Amino acid sequence: LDSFINKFAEYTHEKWAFDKIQNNWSYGENVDEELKTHPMLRPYKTFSEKDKEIYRWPIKESLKAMIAWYNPQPPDLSGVTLSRELQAMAEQLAENYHNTWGRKKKQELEAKGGGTHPLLV
Questions:
Q1: Rounded to whole angstroms, how far apart are CA atoms 109 and 117?
Q2: Is 17 buried (19+), middle (13-18) or exposed (0-12) by CB count in 10 A?
Q3: Helix H segments across the chain?
């Protein structure tokens, strides 16, 4: 929504960075079998533009469509369970993954030169 949204990509990385050290992916060049390292061992608060292809505007529209209608520690988010006022809204948030990306999914197989997938339901 605001400049705080840049810290949401931190959370997506804070959980994503924490398990790598937990699972031998420490640091040094990239994800690899012979190396078994963590490529992006760096906070997103002061980040480069390589994650702007995943986070930012794609995650902004994730948080902007709603208004229309190094060992980081990610905190626990399940402190408050989503009641039916919000549980059915996550039923709509999961619908976004098949609407925003699903529309691209229809435009993914129709912009390659053919192909069909049963997921289009």
A1: 8
A2: buried
A3: 8-22, 57-68, 84-109
